[PDB]
Design a protein around this motif. Structure first.
Motif, short mmCIF file in Angstrom:
data_model
loop_
_atom_site.label_atom_id
_atom_site.label_comp_id
_atom_site.label_asym_id
_atom_site.label_seq_id
_atom_site.Cartn_x
_atom_site.Cartn_y
_atom_site.Cartn_z
N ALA A 383 -6.57 -11.52 -3.70
CA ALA A 383 -7.44 -12.24 -4.66
C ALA A 383 -6.88 -12.22 -6.09
O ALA A 383 -7.09 -13.15 -6.86
N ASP A 384 -6.16 -11.14 -6.41
CA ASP A 384 -5.47 -10.99 -7.69
C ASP A 384 -4.27 -11.93 -7.74
O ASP A 384 -4.03 -12.58 -8.75
N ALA A 385 -3.52 -11.96 -6.63
CA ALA A 385 -2.29 -12.75 -6.51
C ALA A 385 -2.57 -14.24 -6.45
O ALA A 385 -1.77 -15.03 -6.96
N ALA A 386 -3.68 -14.62 -5.82
CA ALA A 386 -4.10 -16.02 -5.75
C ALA A 386 -4.53 -16.56 -7.11
O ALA A 386 -4.32 -17.74 -7.41
N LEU A 387 -5.14 -15.69 -7.91
CA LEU A 387 -5.54 -16.06 -9.25
C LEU A 387 -4.33 -16.15 -10.16
O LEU A 387 -4.24 -17.07 -10.97
N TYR A 424 -13.87 -14.69 -10.01
CA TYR A 424 -13.09 -13.49 -9.70
C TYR A 424 -13.67 -12.25 -10.37
O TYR A 424 -13.81 -11.21 -9.74
N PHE A 425 -14.01 -12.38 -11.66
CA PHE A 425 -14.58 -11.29 -12.48
C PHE A 425 -15.95 -10.85 -11.95
O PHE A 425 -16.25 -9.66 -11.98
N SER A 426 -16.75 -11.80 -11.50
CA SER A 426 -18.07 -11.52 -10.90
C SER A 426 -17.97 -10.77 -9.58
O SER A 426 -18.71 -9.82 -9.35
N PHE A 445 -10.13 -0.86 -11.21
CA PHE A 445 -10.75 -1.33 -12.47
C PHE A 445 -9.66 -1.79 -13.44
O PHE A 445 -9.77 -2.88 -14.00
N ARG A 446 -8.63 -0.97 -13.63
CA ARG A 446 -7.52 -1.31 -14.52
C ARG A 446 -6.77 -2.58 -14.08
O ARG A 446 -6.37 -3.37 -14.93
N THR A 447 -6.61 -2.76 -12.77
CA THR A 447 -5.92 -3.92 -12.22
C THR A 447 -6.69 -5.21 -12.47
O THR A 447 -6.16 -6.12 -13.09
N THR A 448 -7.93 -5.27 -12.00
CA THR A 448 -8.80 -6.45 -12.21
C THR A 448 -8.90 -6.89 -13.67
O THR A 448 -8.91 -8.07 -13.99
N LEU A 449 -8.97 -5.91 -14.55
CA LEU A 449 -9.10 -6.15 -15.96
C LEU A 449 -7.82 -6.74 -16.52
O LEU A 449 -7.86 -7.63 -17.37
N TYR A 450 -6.68 -6.24 -16.05
CA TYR A 450 -5.37 -6.75 -16.45
C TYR A 450 -5.18 -8.20 -16.06
O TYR A 450 -4.63 -8.97 -16.82
N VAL A 451 -5.61 -8.55 -14.86
CA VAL A 451 -5.51 -9.92 -14.35
C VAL A 451 -6.28 -10.87 -15.26
O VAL A 451 -5.74 -11.88 -15.70
#
Ligand SMILES: CSCC[C@H](N)C(=O)OP(=O)(O)OC[C@H]1O[C@@H](n2cnc3c(N)ncnc32)[C@H](O)[C@@H]1O
Length: 509
Positions: A383-387, A424-426, A445-451
């Motif tokens: 989901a991170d990579a797709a974004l 994605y954030f939600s 948490f750190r990963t999602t926020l970085y994206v």
């Protein structure tokens, strides 16, 4: 660093500027700025068309000399463009000396090719359009001669004038339109221009005797040039004509793009190229005619006092909010409506929420929960990579759209990406994850926020053409230096450990 020379139609300073003017300058400033960020060497010309009766008549109704109203109202246009953040390289005025000179030379060459000749003209002149009509193109309505097309009044005009041999260029024009499919955009406007020229062209009056306000025809002081001849010449003057062996003219001419509106297309796609062919000058590469902008009806001023001042509108809503609305609401090329309700809700959902809320919520978490430093991300999930993949493929997509003058679709593509990032954030819900003891959820948490930050960074870079100040404001908040803001920086990711200064709101409104 290939050269790119881009021009706007130059306005009559007979009245104050309306939104339609600001629409043309904003669209063209977007193209200009995109090109600078994409490493092109941009020359961007705009200005005013100070000659002609239209301006002279507005002067007498004020009770003043013509040159006075010219300089004053030209300053208003110029000051208006400063306010809207139009990054013009030169602001050309037709009273300028070198402009006078450029026009004289253009005439001398058309003379020297045998395309100018003295003759008697009889016909109908519309002062509002600065343009001739035949009797067939006017209607008599309650004892008043109005043009069939525009509904504007006309004047009977009998004079002895110089004509241009326009009929000679009909088939050379048709050859050009055929050989250069991308010369006239959009495609609807192309087939209109091709229709008209296929019907056959008649010779064109290009001088006037009855008034002295304009560029004098060389070796015939008794004449001034038709305002459109001298006006079209501004594009040559903006690249150092008549000095054809100068750096500027060698570098920038031919113009890569003339932005104009659909009412003046004939001058630009028929008359202008023929003058250039006659004068042995290289034609411009492309002409984009943009559509009109209404207020539920065409803005009529006196008929309907429904004019929209773009300077008021810019103070009322913010410069960048207006530049975004104009380039987003309407598909560039089509006609569109302005309304007070449409713009506020557009600014509210698109900028205040989808963009600015996403930025403030991510940049605040960095400040509170991470000591205002950009976090170190771990293995990106799918989901991170797709974004990240959609956002990494935006520069190519947006670039394609800017090259067809489809700024609206670039903005749509940038906002479909922002809509994914919000979802994605939600669904990653980092506000939950920041409050957790396990080191798995802390890295996550750190990963999602970085994206979210890296995505917003990309959006900001690509939005610089449309919203220079607000884009810059966001890049400030993401710790980006003044040399990491071109489109080359899109390819280089947000470095972990960067200091982000304390969050302030991007859209305080
Ligand atoms: C060598 S070029 C000289 C051009 C000549 N000087 C001239 O045409 O003078 P101008 O001051 O009326 O220029 C108005 C420009 O803005 C657009 N425009 C104007 N009103 C508009 C509206 N309500 N909506 C959308 N577009 C509009 C219109 O299409 C035109 O391109």
């Amino acid at each position: 660093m290939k050269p790119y020379y881009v021009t706007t139609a130059i306005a009559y300073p007979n009245a104050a500027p309306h939104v339609g003017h600001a629409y043309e300058y904003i669209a063209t400033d977007a193209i200009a700025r995109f090109k600078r960020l994409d490493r092109y060497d941009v020359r961007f010309l705009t200005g005013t068309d100070e000659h002609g009766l239209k301006v002279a008549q507005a002067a007498a109704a004020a009770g003043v000399p013509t040159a006075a109203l010219a300089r004053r109202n030209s300053d208003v246009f110029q000051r208006m463009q400063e306010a809207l953040n139009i990054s013009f390289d030169r602001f050309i005025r037709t009273t300028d000396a070198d402009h006078h000179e450029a026009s004289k030379e253009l005439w001398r060459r058309m003379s020297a090719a045998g395309d100018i000749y003295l003759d008697n003209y009889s016909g109908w002149y519309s002062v509002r359009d600065e343009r001739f009509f035949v009797e067939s193109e006017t209607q008599l309505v309650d004892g008043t001669r109005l043009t069939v097309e525009t509904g504007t009044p006309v004047t009977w005009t009998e004079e002895q004038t110089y004509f241009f041999r326009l009929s000679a260029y009909t088939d050379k024009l048709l050859a050009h339109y055929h050989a250069n499919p991308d010369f006239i955009a959009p495609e609807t406007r192309r087939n209109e221009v091709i229709s008209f020229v296929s019907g056959g062209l008649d010779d064109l009056s290009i001088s006037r005797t009855s008034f002295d306000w304009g560029v004098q025809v060389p070796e015939h002081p008794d004449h001034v040039m038709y305002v459109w001849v001298d006006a079209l010449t501004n594009y040559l003057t903006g690249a150092g004509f008549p000095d054809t062996d100068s750096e500027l003219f060698r570098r920038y001419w031919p113009a890569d793009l003339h932005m104009i509106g659909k009412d003046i297309i004939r001058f630009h796609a028929v008359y202008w190229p023929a003058f250039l062919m006659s004068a042995g000058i290289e034609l411009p590469r492309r002409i984009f005619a943009h559509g009109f902008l209404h207020n539920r009806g065409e803005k009529m001023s006196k008929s309907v006092g429904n004019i929209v001042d773009p300077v008021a509108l810019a103070e009322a809503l913010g410069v960048d909010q207006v530049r975004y609305f104009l380039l987003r609401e309407v598909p560039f090329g089509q006609d569109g409506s302005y309304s007070d309700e449409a713009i506020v809700t557009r600014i509210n959902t698109d900028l205040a929420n989808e963009l600015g809320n996403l930025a403030q919520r991510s940049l605040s978490m960095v400040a509170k929960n991470l000591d205002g430093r950009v976090p170190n991300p771990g293995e990106f999930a799918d989901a991170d990579a797709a974004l990240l993949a959609t956002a990494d493929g935006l520069l190519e997509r947006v670039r394609g759209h800017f090259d067809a003058q489809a700024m609206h679709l670039a903005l749509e593509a940038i906002w479909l990406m922002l809509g994914d990032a919000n979802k994605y954030f939600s669904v990653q819900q980092p506000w939950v994850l920041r409050k957790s003891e396990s080191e798995a959820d802390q890295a996550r948490f750190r990963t999602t926020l970085y994206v979210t930050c890296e995505v917003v960074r990309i959006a900001a870079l690509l939005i610089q053409p449309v919203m220079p100040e607000s884009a810059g404001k966001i890049l400030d908040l993401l710790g980006q230096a003044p040399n990491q803001r071109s489109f080359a920086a899109v390819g280089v990711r947000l470095t972990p450990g960067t200091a982000l200064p304390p969050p302030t709101g991007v859209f305080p409104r």
